[PDB]
Structure formats: C-alpha cells, structure tokens
Write a protein that holds these residues in place. Structure first.
Motif, PDB file in Angstrom:
ATOM      1  N   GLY A 176       0.805  -1.211   0.000  1.00  0.00           N
ATOM      2  CA  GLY A 176       0.000   0.000   0.000  1.00  0.00           C
ATOM      3  C   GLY A 176       0.840   1.263   0.000  1.00  0.00           C
ATOM      4  N   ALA A 177       0.339   2.280   0.694  1.00  0.00           N
ATOM      5  CA  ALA A 177       0.992   3.577   0.782  1.00  0.00           C
ATOM      6  C   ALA A 177       0.496   4.265   2.042  1.00  0.00           C
ATOM      7  CB  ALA A 177       0.716   4.440  -0.454  1.00  0.00           C
ATOM      8  N   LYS A 178       1.255   5.256   2.493  1.00  0.00           N
ATOM      9  CA  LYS A 178       1.008   5.847   3.798  1.00  0.00           C
ATOM     10  C   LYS A 178       1.321   7.337   3.733  1.00  0.00           C
ATOM     11  CE  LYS A 178       1.960   4.833   8.705  1.00  0.00           C
ATOM     12  NZ  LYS A 178       2.770   4.001   9.634  1.00  0.00           N
ATOM     13  N   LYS A 179       0.631   8.106   4.584  1.00  0.00           N
ATOM     14  CA  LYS A 179       0.864   9.541   4.724  1.00  0.00           C
ATOM     15  C   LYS A 179       2.308   9.837   5.098  1.00  0.00           C
ATOM     16  CE  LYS A 179      -3.738  11.153   6.105  1.00  0.00           C
ATOM     17  NZ  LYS A 179      -3.793  12.317   5.196  1.00  0.00           N
ATOM     18  N   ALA A 180       2.846  10.909   4.516  1.00  0.00           N
ATOM     19  CA  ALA A 180       4.235  11.265   4.775  1.00  0.00           C
ATOM     20  C   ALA A 180       4.406  11.884   6.155  1.00  0.00           C
ATOM     21  CB  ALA A 180       4.740  12.219   3.693  1.00  0.00           C
ATOM     22  N   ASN A 181       3.410  12.638   6.624  1.00  0.00           N
ATOM     23  CA  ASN A 181       3.559  13.369   7.876  1.00  0.00           C
ATOM     24  C   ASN A 181       3.353  12.510   9.116  1.00  0.00           C
ATOM     25  OD1 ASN A 181       0.776  13.035   7.613  1.00  0.00           O
ATOM     26  ND2 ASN A 181       0.280  15.213   7.771  1.00  0.00           N
ATOM     27  N   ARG A 182       2.914  11.261   8.972  1.00  0.00           N
ATOM     28  CA  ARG A 182       2.672  10.416  10.129  1.00  0.00           C
ATOM     29  C   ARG A 182       3.622   9.226  10.198  1.00  0.00           C
ATOM     30  NH1 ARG A 182      -1.620  10.669  13.626  1.00  0.00           N
ATOM     31  NH2 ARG A 182      -2.719  12.089  12.209  1.00  0.00           N
ATOM     32  N   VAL A 183       4.312   8.898   9.114  1.00  0.00           N
ATOM     33  CA  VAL A 183       5.371   7.898   9.184  1.00  0.00           C
ATOM     34  C   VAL A 183       6.598   8.528   9.837  1.00  0.00           C
ATOM     35  CG1 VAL A 183       6.021   8.355   6.746  1.00  0.00           C
ATOM     36  CG2 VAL A 183       6.756   6.263   7.875  1.00  0.00           C
ATOM     37  N   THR A 184       7.133   7.860  10.855  1.00  0.00           N
ATOM     38  CA  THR A 184       8.206   8.434  11.652  1.00  0.00           C
ATOM     39  C   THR A 184       9.547   8.303  10.934  1.00  0.00           C
ATOM     40  OG1 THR A 184       8.530   6.369  12.878  1.00  0.00           O
ATOM     41  CG2 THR A 184       6.959   7.954  13.766  1.00  0.00           C
ATOM     42  N   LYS A 185      10.554   9.001  11.465  1.00  0.00           N
ATOM     43  CA  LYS A 185      11.896   9.028  10.881  1.00  0.00           C
ATOM     44  C   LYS A 185      12.710   7.735  10.996  1.00  0.00           C
ATOM     45  CE  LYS A 185      14.512  12.670  10.990  1.00  0.00           C
ATOM     46  NZ  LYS A 185      15.291  13.857  11.429  1.00  0.00           N
ATOM     47  N   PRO A 186      12.608   6.915  12.066  1.00  0.00           N
ATOM     48  CA  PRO A 186      13.182   5.559  11.954  1.00  0.00           C
ATOM     49  C   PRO A 186      12.554   4.727  10.853  1.00  0.00           C
ATOM     50  CG  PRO A 186      12.912   6.090  14.232  1.00  0.00           C
ATOM     51  CD  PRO A 186      12.290   7.214  13.480  1.00  0.00           C
ATOM     52  N   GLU A 187      11.227   4.775  10.738  1.00  0.00           N
ATOM     53  CA  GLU A 187      10.537   4.093   9.652  1.00  0.00           C
ATOM     54  C   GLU A 187      10.886   4.702   8.301  1.00  0.00           C
ATOM     55  OE1 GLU A 187       6.412   4.232  10.534  1.00  0.00           O
ATOM     56  OE2 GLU A 187       6.505   2.703  12.106  1.00  0.00           O
ATOM     57  N   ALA A 188      11.035   6.031   8.248  1.00  0.00           N
ATOM     58  CA  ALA A 188      11.403   6.700   7.001  1.00  0.00           C
ATOM     59  C   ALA A 188      12.795   6.292   6.544  1.00  0.00           C
ATOM     60  CB  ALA A 188      11.329   8.217   7.163  1.00  0.00           C
ATOM     61  N   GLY A 189      13.737   6.172   7.483  1.00  0.00           N
ATOM     62  CA  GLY A 189      15.062   5.688   7.131  1.00  0.00           C
ATOM     63  C   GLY A 189      15.067   4.232   6.707  1.00  0.00           C
ATOM     64  N   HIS A 190      14.258   3.398   7.375  1.00  0.00           N
ATOM     65  CA  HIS A 190      14.184   1.980   7.023  1.00  0.00           C
ATOM     66  C   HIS A 190      13.610   1.771   5.628  1.00  0.00           C
ATOM     67  CE1 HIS A 190      13.738  -2.355   7.516  1.00  0.00           C
ATOM     68  NE2 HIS A 190      12.517  -2.219   7.036  1.00  0.00           N
ATOM     69  N   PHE A 191      12.586   2.545   5.257  1.00  0.00           N
ATOM     70  CA  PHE A 191      12.064   2.434   3.900  1.00  0.00           C
ATOM     71  C   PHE A 191      13.000   3.078   2.885  1.00  0.00           C
ATOM     72  CE2 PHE A 191       7.930   1.787   6.080  1.00  0.00           C
ATOM     73  CZ  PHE A 191       7.553   0.621   5.448  1.00  0.00           C
ATOM     74  N   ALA A 192      13.624   4.204   3.238  1.00  0.00           N
ATOM     75  CA  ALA A 192      14.444   4.939   2.287  1.00  0.00           C
ATOM     76  C   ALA A 192      15.800   4.298   2.036  1.00  0.00           C
ATOM     77  CB  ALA A 192      14.641   6.377   2.766  1.00  0.00           C
ATOM     78  N   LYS A 193      16.237   3.363   2.887  1.00  0.00           N
ATOM     79  CA  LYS A 193      17.452   2.620   2.568  1.00  0.00           C
ATOM     80  C   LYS A 193      17.251   1.741   1.338  1.00  0.00           C
ATOM     81  CE  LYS A 193      21.115  -0.271   4.353  1.00  0.00           C
ATOM     82  NZ  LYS A 193      21.668  -1.052   5.487  1.00  0.00           N
ATOM     83  N   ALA A 194      16.064   1.155   1.194  1.00  0.00           N
ATOM     84  CA  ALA A 194      15.737   0.352   0.024  1.00  0.00           C
ATOM     85  C   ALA A 194      15.350   1.188  -1.188  1.00  0.00           C
ATOM     86  CB  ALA A 194      14.594  -0.604   0.357  1.00  0.00           C
ATOM     87  N   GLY A 195      15.256   2.509  -1.044  1.00  0.00           N
ATOM     88  CA  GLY A 195      14.753   3.345  -2.114  1.00  0.00           C
ATOM     89  C   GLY A 195      13.284   3.162  -2.403  1.00  0.00           C
ATOM     90  N   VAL A 196      12.529   2.614  -1.457  1.00  0.00           N
ATOM     91  CA  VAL A 196      11.163   2.184  -1.706  1.00  0.00           C
ATOM     92  C   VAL A 196      10.217   3.130  -0.980  1.00  0.00           C
ATOM     93  CG1 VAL A 196      10.868   0.531   0.230  1.00  0.00           C
ATOM     94  CG2 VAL A 196       9.817   0.074  -2.011  1.00  0.00           C
ATOM     95  N   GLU A 197       9.003   3.258  -1.504  1.00  0.00           N
ATOM     96  CA  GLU A 197       8.001   4.104  -0.878  1.00  0.00           C
ATOM     97  C   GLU A 197       7.409   3.386   0.326  1.00  0.00           C
ATOM     98  OE1 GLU A 197       5.031   5.381  -3.628  1.00  0.00           O
ATOM     99  OE2 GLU A 197       4.123   6.835  -2.255  1.00  0.00           O
TER     100      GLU A 197
END
Lengths: 209, 56, 122, 114, 120, 22
Positions: A53-74
């Motif tokens: 799926g997909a999720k709001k940008a303002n409610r996903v936290t920065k540890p989660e943002a780093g974990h997803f962004a390491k894979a380059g994935v949304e």
RNA sequence: GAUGUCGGCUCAUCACAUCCUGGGGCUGAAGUAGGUCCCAAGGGUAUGGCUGUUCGCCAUUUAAAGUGGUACGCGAGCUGGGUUUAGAACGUCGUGAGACAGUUCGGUCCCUAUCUGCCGUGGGCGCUGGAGAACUGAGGGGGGCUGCUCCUAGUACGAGAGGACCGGAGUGGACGCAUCACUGGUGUUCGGGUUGUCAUGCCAAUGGCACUGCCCGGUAGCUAAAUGCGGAAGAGAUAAGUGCUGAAAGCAUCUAAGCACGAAACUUGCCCCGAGAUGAGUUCUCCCUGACCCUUUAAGGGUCCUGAAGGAACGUUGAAGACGACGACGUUGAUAGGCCGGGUGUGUAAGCGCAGCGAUGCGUUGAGCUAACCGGUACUAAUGAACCGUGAGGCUUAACCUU
RNA sequence: AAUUCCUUGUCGGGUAAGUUCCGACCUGCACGAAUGGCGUAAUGAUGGCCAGGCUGUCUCCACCCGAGACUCAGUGAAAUU
RNA sequence: CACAGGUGGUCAGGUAGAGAAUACCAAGGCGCUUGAGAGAACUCGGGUGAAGGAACUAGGCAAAAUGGUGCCGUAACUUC
RNA sequence: AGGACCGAACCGACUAAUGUUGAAAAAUUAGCGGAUGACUUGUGGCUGGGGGUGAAAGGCCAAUCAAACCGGGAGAUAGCU
C-alpha cells in the motif's frame, strides 16, 4: 513458501457454469515490495520483509522513514515478514505480485478476528445455559461450578471463564483459491476468512497438502 | 465475602498507588486576548481560536 | 429438520395418517433428520383397513420437510408440512404403492428409486 | 466495494423482466436427471421479492397435489432459464406471506387492471 | 456489542429521546444558540440539520413534514421563512459545536451549539 | 431489631426465617 | 463457641483394573464374527418411559454406551423431589401423653469477595544513552473422535451359507475455529395498516398516550438452524510383540557385543500465546557532539544556554473497547457529523382534479419518506503552540583498523 | 387402598417403552360398621393420572428495549478482623 | 428515617364502556432531593423468534394460549 | 328468592419471581379466593396470666407466649464453661 499481504474487501458470490454457488472472499493484494532480506550470515535465518500500500508522509516516523528509504522504496501501511524455503532467493526492492498464486490450488489465510469484547462463558466456550425456570435464582447464564471441594482446593489453570473474545490472530486453512486476477489485483478464495472488511490479511500457500 | 485478617496500611497504600490524579499542564494561550484556557475550549471571557465567540 | 416427538404426515397408502418420530438414525447424538434421512417411527393414527396398525415401531424416510432443502445455487424449497414415506425394518423399497404429493431430488441415491419413480412431481 | 460491485455487475443477467408480488409467474429451471439436462416449469404466485443486485431472489408459492410448495429462486443464477409473467395481481404489500395461511376461495387476489 | 451502530441511547427510552430532541431542536431554532451537554449537542446535529435541509425548499408538503417533526407553528415559520434562505447556499454544517468547560452540579462536559451566522 | 432468618438456630443468617433474631 | 444431608442441573478433573478406536501373542483362530491375554489413557463414550431416586428394568439407537477417585467432586454456583422441625390423616403399638429406620397431603435455601486460585486487561520500573519497528523461539496452551458407501473383490477363505487383511477415495454424525456471501431470526433508531382518546381554532393532515397500543414487513449490525474449514500425512525415539547375526552352554537361543522393524501413547510436524527467556536475546532504522561553579575529587550535586528522535496530552473517532489498552485521523486533512448522488426497505405521500349520494375509488404516481449501508464532497468540528523526553552513553580484558 | 412389609404381587387398559394412574383378583403383615362402613349429584386457589390446544419449558439458544453493573463529579456505609 | 407499608368519612366532570373496570383527558396537582456519560460479562423487568412442540422437570413451575355481546347448539350422571 | 353466578371498591393471601447488610424486623409486581353475607369496617366498652379468649393452630393476649410484661425474693442455684 512466501505469502502476500492483502486487504479483505468483503464477500461476494461466483456462479459456476453448471449452476453451483461458490461463496468467495475478495482480497485486494497490491504490490508487495521487499524492504529487507535476511540470511544466516547477518541474521541467523532466511526471511524477507515485505510492505504494501501507501502511507501519509507526515505520520510515518523518521526511523521508519530511514528503514524504507534505505531500500529506495516508498513507505507502506505496515511491515510483515515471511520465512523462505531455500529454493526461493529474492533481493531488496522486488515487487511480489498476486500472479504467484496462479498454480497454488489451496491457500491458508491468517487474519485478526472480530473483537467480541468481554464475552461470557455461554458465548465464548459453548457452555450450556441453566434452567430458565423450575426454581432458578439469579443463575441462568452463570458458569456453574469451577472446581471440586478440599482436594485440590483451587481452580486449575486453563479453566474456561469469561473474558476477552476475538481481536486475535487466527488462521483458516486449505481454502480452495477460486480466481487470481492481476488486472484488478484480486484474489478470490472459496469460503470466509477472519477479520472485518478493511483488515490486513496474510495469504500463504497451504501446508496440509 | 468478608476478610479474615485486617490488611495493613502498607497494602492500603499499595492499593491507592494508582488513585493519583494526572495534572493537566497543557493550558493553551488565546492569540487575540492572551488568556489562559483549556485546549479546545472557550475562555472565561469567551473567545475561541482568535475570533469572538459567545459572551461573558 | 425432524427430531424426536415430531408429528409427521404419511405420504403413502400404507394405512397410517399421523406418525411420531421416536429416533433419528445414523449416528450418536444426531439431532435432526433432513430429506435423505432414515427415522424410526411409531404410528399414532391409521385407517381401519390399512396394511399397518396403531402402535407399530417401524422405519420411515422423510420426504417433505417444512424447513426445506438447499440446492447448490442457494435455493430453498419449503413445503407446508412434514411428511415421511413409511419403510420396512429390514426389506426396503417401501410398504406403500402410492405417494401423495411431490418429493425432492435428494432421494435419488440408488436406495429410494421406487419413491422417486412413483412420485407425481419431482 | 467498487471492487465488489464491479465484480458483481459482470455476472448479472441483463434481460430479467420486471414483475411485482402478486404476479402469477412461470419460472423455467434446468434440472439434471442423471446425465440429461432438461427444463421443468414452476408456475405460481410471487409472494416475496428481495432485491440486492447480484444477490437478488424471489419466492414463488404454488399448490401441488395436496399442499403448498414454496421455492425461493436466486434471480441471477444460471439454473433459471426464463421468468414469464402470465397474470398481474393487485396487492398493497411487498411480502404476501399471509397467503401461507389462506387457501382456496379466500386466497384469491385481484388483477392490476390498468 | 455495538458494531457499526449509530445513535446515543442517552440513558432514556425512545419516547423520551424523541421528545427531548424535539424540544431541544425547537429551542435551537428559536434562540439560535443554546448550551447543553456535549453528547446531547452532538446528537442535536442529526436532528436540527435535516430540518434546515427540509426547509431549504418551501412547499405545503415540506411544511407538514416539518410540522410532523418539532410540533410548533412558530418554529416551522422560522424554519421556512428565515433559516431556509440564509443556509440556502451552505451545503450542510448548519451548526457549530463549542466546548465550554464543565457544569457545577455534576461535572458534565458542557457545549454551546449554535448556528453559523446567528445575525446577532 | 428482630428479623429472624435461619431454619433453626438462635441467630444465624440464612434467608429463611424461624430462627434468628439477634 | 456449626465442616449444610440424598438425588438432579451446570462445570469439571485425575487413575487404568480399557468400553470403543490403535498394536500384538495364543485360539477347540478356515473367512466374517468371536474368546482370552499383553501393551496403550490421544480422543470419544446416547435419548426417552417409570420412579425423588443413585441404581435397575424397559424401548430405540450407537464405533462404544467403561469402572473408580476427587468432603460417596461440585448449595459464599443453582434446585429442593427425598430426607431429619412445627399442621393433618391411615395401619400398628400404647390406658394415655405420644411413638414407628411404616405410609400419605402441605411446608422460607442469606452473603456487596479481603487473601490464595483462575479467566481477562492494564500502570510502573527493569533490560545500562534514548527511541521507532520487524523478528528468533527457551517454554506453554489448543487440537488428536469415528461411522457408512464404493473400489480392491463377490477375489483370497469356504461343503454350502456367507465373506475379508493391506491400501485408496467419497459422503455423514458429534465437536471446534472463522464468517454473514446465501437461507433465516432479531431489528422499541425505517416504512405502512388500524382501535380508543387528547391536542395542534376547525375540515384535511398530523403528533402524544394506551406493553413499541396492537400488528404487518424490514436496512445495517449481531447471529444459527445458514456455509467454508480442521482432526492429517510424514519423521524420530519407543511399549507389548516380531526378528537377524551370535556366544556364554561345540548345538540351540531376539541379547550378553552389535543390528533391524514395531501403536491413536511420547518428541516433532498443524494452529495460538510468548525475551519480566532478570539466561531480560537478535536485526534494521533514527536522534542527541556547547560551556561554568563548589567540595567528603566521583558512576557527586548545582547553574546557564539547549528541549533532538520520539512519546504522551488534547480533539474528531473505530466492524477496537467495562476502564485503561489497540487502530485510523488532526487543514500538506475524508476522522466523524452534515450534504449530494445511489442502494435498500416500505408500498402508489400530501395537495389538486374526476367519478360516487357517501364510505371510497381513480389520475398526477412505483409516488413520497428512508437508520446504522455504498461512492463522493471541507460546509461544521478536529488551533498556532505548550508538556515529558536531552546535550554522545561506565569499568576491566582481548582482538581488528595496522597478521 | 391416605391402610400392603415382602412389592415395581399377578392379569388387563393407557405408552415405542408406565415403581405413578384406572379396572379386577384376595395370599386384609396390620380395612371394617356413628373414635362410623360403603356409595354419592354439586362444590374445591384440595391430591394423583391422561388428552386436545398452546407455547423459549426444552433441543439450543439468538437479537432487541429499559433499570443496575463500568467511567467521571458529589456524598458515603456494613458484617469481619 | 423527608421509609415503595398501614389509616375512617364526604365530594365523584368529558369521550368510549354494562360500570366507581379500563384507556385518553378537564379542573386541580405533580415529574417522586444525586446527576453526567459509556452501551462489556452477568443480574432484574419486558418484546420477538426458524424447524420441532413438554422431548424440560419432582411436577406443563413460569410463560404461551383462551377471553366480549347477540344467536344456533350442547353428553354421561343427577339430590331434577 | 338465594351462606345464588360473574365482577370493581373492600376483606383476604393460592402460585411464581424479586428483595433477603430489603423501599419493608413479612413487602412489591403479575396472576389469584370471597364479594348480601357464618360479610366487612369506624368508634366506644367488657374479659388479665395457670388466667383470658380460641369455627382449635398450643393459635392470639402491644414486633415476646407449652404460660405476657415490669418490679421484688435476688448477688436463686450452677459438681458446668
């Protein structure tokens, strides 16, 4: 084998050609993309960690943002993990589709069942209601006795009593998969699966063969 | 359904360990008049989120 | 959906009018008898010159329920009465030689060929 | 929901005619006698119509050989071949369930004569 | 349980809920701002706002349907003569909830429910 | 005081009623 | 200076001297069906008539209707028919009062749970800098029943009558989990009919009350009688048993060395909980890098500037829920209400007109109304900020950067 | 049998199946004639049994409506120890 | 006890009804001296219920059911 | 006409359920018996404790009855706790 994380859409009915009704449950399985692969070298076991799926940008936290962004994935609505079978080998960022289930013939669906609240013993354990009359004082739907007399002299562990019912992980097994269509991103399985409409589901290939 | 031994004042203070009141500490300041109010409530003079509301 | 103390009708010319189901056969704790099901009956009313008499413990097969049947597409068939065709204790293919009223497709199971043949409808 | 309704509106029969409760209706149903596939007709008074899109059904009551047979038919199922309306009745209800208690000259209904 | 069920019971039967919603809807149409408890102010939206939606369009049948509810000639006069053509362009949201602390006798969470404009 | 309450004692509790006034 | 009595209901739980299912020896075991004995407690183990009955007899089932322990389990869980209060009567005993471990009719069953236990759900601290997630699985719990049909095959077996082992598949019963698509129940929050009466000035139309006044249908939600699924297969170690090789004991011998089979029992395999597994684990990601005093000079306290990741709080809420908790959302917004369209349900609204003397019928009209449903829409409410949480994380030793 | 211990005596009726019920037998442990015997129309909030109707009494529970139970504010016991 | 109890007499409206029953009302009098929410188990007071219909139980306990006026018709037995 | 029938007031109390630290030291709710009589009720009066009165249960005689309550004998007695 690996599973796919879907959403329960509801139930409907497929008519066969020879006039037979199949009760189907509709599972919307979007692009399940791998966020992490685990092996015996770094982790001790073989697994993959998918999201969906997909999720709001303002409610996903920065540890989660780093974990997803390491894979380059949304980012997605959650993180799930499936255990590999040593024949399959996957890399990070591969989208797993519903077309995997084109030849599986039977699935196991794992969901979170509907929450019944604080249920009673009649509803939760199929106890018999006592007499509605013939003298009965304030004790129609009560559990009755919960033990012996002075020997043991306690209630045993695992006694059937009132308490929380549902809102729990349950798996329904060996459901005949009726229809797999990736143009609509849909899995149609025969029968009923745990959970309300709009709830996360895990769909695995079956194990009872 | 009655006790066989009087509970102590230790056990009495242990039961009241969760009777404590959570203080609020989250009072908001109105931007127009600079009055302290509860968050998402009107003021004692009666403003809410800057613009004038009811009365009194 | 037949259980004990159920008063059924009789759907053959065997003689009896109203029977009572005293046992539903085919299993332990078995509660209900559908339409392919064998029951044990007693006779509560008959005709004076019939083949069977009042107070005989024999078998029957329930051929019309009021709860109904279910078909594979989801289509029920509710009759307005409960009726069994009276069988014999050992030698089947029943006592009667007529059948009043219709039956359903669930008696086509190689053991009630005479009932589905003699039936006026279905 | 859009998934479900879009998946249901490709199995629906597009030619099922309009009919009301009280309408004498002959439904023709495919039956399987061994390995033969044959139509049989079921004519009676429609006493209930439940409308749910694909999940629609209707109840037909007739009197066969002594007593009343009620069949509930799934409307969009491929077991029904045709639904033909012969007589058009005049009632003031959506469910004609009281006809379960009435038989004979008391179970007559009118004709919607316009 | 209570799955997908709407409607506060409000510690009353159905008769008293209907009469109390009727009186409180008449009081909000009359005075245009009233003060009640917060769950009653939230159930009053579902009662008052379909009356203003009904009173957008004036007809004899809409007036007798708005008099089948609320049971008052002066209230239905103000519905079809004032509140209808003031909220004729606003599509819902005819009223506003404003929480105002608590009440001295029972610590009830109070709320002002008012109309959007009020002409005051 | 004077309500009784047992089948037969001088004073016990008991929900019956012929024995029992303390 | 009180441990409440038989029987029933509800809820159980253990033992094996096993009733069925599973394995095996012997059989006066041809087959089927038995008889006896050894192993095995995983699962299951009936409904009625009579009687207060436990029991027993009977009737019809069933794979089978096990035997016992548990204060002859179970009244701070229910009952109160029996029985051992007070009334009355029969038979009998007694001159009598009365009595009978003889009979008959009638006869009040309290407890707001402190502690242990048990079922659920949370707060705090810990886990050594703080934090957000996903796991590993030490351990624990759930489950484990079986009929009938068909094929093998009317083959093996047998004078006939009859009739299989092993293996495979289908359909049931009982139990359990899930669910609402179907079929139904409910649906005092939706529509309609109708009785009496009161009111809205009156007719007309409505509303209030009469158990929702009485009904008839019925949305969502919940739900079973409804419909999907499950009990496995396989492996490992075994019991009784069957052995192979083989001495002691030139032979023989299943055992002493060694090795191979072997059951619903045991360890897994299936499901569920689970790192408070203090033995507090692992992995991924994020954030915090400024200086001054005092002295019992260290794993000390205080002061300025700072207030990160994140969390709570507040609000809109939820197919989550006693409360906490858990999930969605807070203007970069569809979270709820309203609104718009639809769907569903009820069944042709009111007003006007025509016809009828009138009740009423007909047209406008499948009309009006429509809750919780579906898809959209910022109109209303989800306020900027404040609050908690910090400022690079101890010591010893080893190894790599850099053998 | 409001009386019978053995006893659920035996036969019959009612039931699929009847220790109760109704008829009869007499082997009356231990009926019996105003401490009344045997009948008996009507009557009984009397006792036993059977049947039609009707039903959540039950198979087997499901949902709904109110009052408590739960949370918040005010007040505030008791047995026991 | 500012307690669901007890306490004699008199007055006695409208509509429907046989009626002082009952239902809705008038004159008059009240809303019963803790409220606000939430909408768990369980308890109480009720409503409805598929198919079966006493299988429940000591026992049809409790519920369900019947229910009014006019007219037709009505057995055994009887002390008529 | 009637110790007549049905049924409100009124007099009772047959069954169930609730309550059982109750709203109540015997009630409430729903059904129930009588209801022109051997009825019920107001007010006054008389009967006194081994006595009264009793359509008779040892029932009632001020929430007490196989012998009321209050004071006295009286600090009865107690091989018992």
């Amino acid at each position: 084998m690996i599973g796919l994380v879907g959403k329960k859409v509801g139930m409907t009915r497929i008519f066969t050609e020879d006039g037979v009704s199949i009760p189907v449950t509709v599972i919307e399985v979007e692009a399940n993309r791998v966020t992490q692969v685990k092996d015996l070298a770094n982790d001790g076991y073989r697994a993959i960690q998918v999201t969906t799926g997909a999720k709001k940008a303002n409610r996903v936290t920065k540890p989660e943002a780093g974990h997803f962004a390491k894979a380059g994935v949304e980012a997605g609505r959650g993180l799930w993990e499936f255990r590999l079978a040593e024949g399959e080998e996957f890399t990070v960022g591969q989208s797993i589709s519903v077309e995997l289930f084109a030849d599986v013939k039977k699935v196991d669906v794992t969901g979170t069942s509907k929450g019944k609240g604080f249920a009673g013993t009649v509803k939760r354990w199929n106890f018999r209601t006592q007499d509605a009359t013939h003298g009965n004082s304030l004790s129609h739907r009560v559990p009755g006795s919960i033990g012996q007399n002075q020997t043991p002299g306690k209630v045993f562990k695992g006694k059937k009593m009132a308490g929380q019912m549902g809102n729990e992980r349950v798996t329904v097994q060996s459901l005949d998969v009726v229809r797999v269509d990736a143009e609509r991103n849909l899995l149609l399985v025969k029968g009923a699966v745990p959970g309300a409409t709009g709830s996360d589901l895990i769909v695995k290939p079956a194990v009872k063969a | 359904a009655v006790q066989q031994n009087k509970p102590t004042r230790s056990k009495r203070g242990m039961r009241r360990s969760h009777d404590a009141l959570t203080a609020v500490t989250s009072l908001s300041v109105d931007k127009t008049s600079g009055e302290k109010h509860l968050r998402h409530h009107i003021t004692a003079d009666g403003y809410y989120r800057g613009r004038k509301v009811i009365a009194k | 959906m037949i259980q004990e103390q159920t008063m059924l009708n009789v759907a053959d010319n065997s003689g009896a009018r109203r029977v009572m189901c005293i046992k539903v056969l085919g299993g332990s704790h078995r509660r209900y008898a559908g339409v392919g099901d064998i029951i044990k009956i007693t006779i509560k009313e008959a005709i004076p010159r019939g083949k069977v008499k009042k107070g005989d413990v024999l078998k029957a097969v329930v051929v019309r329920t009021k709860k109904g049947v279910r078909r594979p597409d989801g289509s029920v068939i509710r009759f307005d009465g409960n009726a069994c065709v009276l069988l014999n204790n050992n030698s089947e293919q029943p006592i009667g030689t007529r059948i009043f009223g219709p039956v359903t497709r669930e008696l086509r199971s190689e053991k009630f060929m005479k009932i589905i043949s003699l039936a006026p409808e279905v | 929901s859009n998934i479900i309704k879009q998946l249901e509106q490709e199995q629906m029969k597009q030619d099922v005619p309009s009919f009301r409760p009280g309408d004498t209706v002959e439904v023709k149903v495919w039956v399987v006698e061994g390995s033969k596939k044959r139509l049989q007709a079921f004519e009676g008074v429609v006493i209930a119509i439940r409308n749910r899109g694909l999940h629609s059904a209707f109840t037909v009551r007739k009197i066969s050989n002594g007593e009343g047979v009620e069949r509930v038919f799934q409307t969009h199922s491929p077991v029904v071949d045709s639904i033909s309306v012969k007589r058009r009745g005049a009632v003031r209800k959506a469910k004609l369930y009281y006809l379960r208690e009435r038989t004979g000259k008391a179970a007559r209904i009118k004709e919607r004569l316009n | 349980m209570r799955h997908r069920k709407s409607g506060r019971q409000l510690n009353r039967n159905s008769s008293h809920r209907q009469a109390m919603f009727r009186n409180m809807a008449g009081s909000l149409v009359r005075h245009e701002i009233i003060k009640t408890t917060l769950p009653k102010a939230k159930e009053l939206r579902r009662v008052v706002e379909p009356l203003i939606t009904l009173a957008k369009t004036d007809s004899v049948a809409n007036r007798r349907l708005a008099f089948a509810r609320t049971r008052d000639n002066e209230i239905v006069a103000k519905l079809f003569n004032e509140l209808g053509p003031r909220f004729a362009s606003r599509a819902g949201g005819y009223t506003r909830i404003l929480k105002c602390g608590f009440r001295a006798g029972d610590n009830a969470p109070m709320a002002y429910i008012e109309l959007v404009d009020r002409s005051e | 005081t004077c309500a009784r309450c047992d089948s037969x004692s001088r004073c016990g509790a008991x929900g019956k009623x012929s024995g029992x006034a303390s």
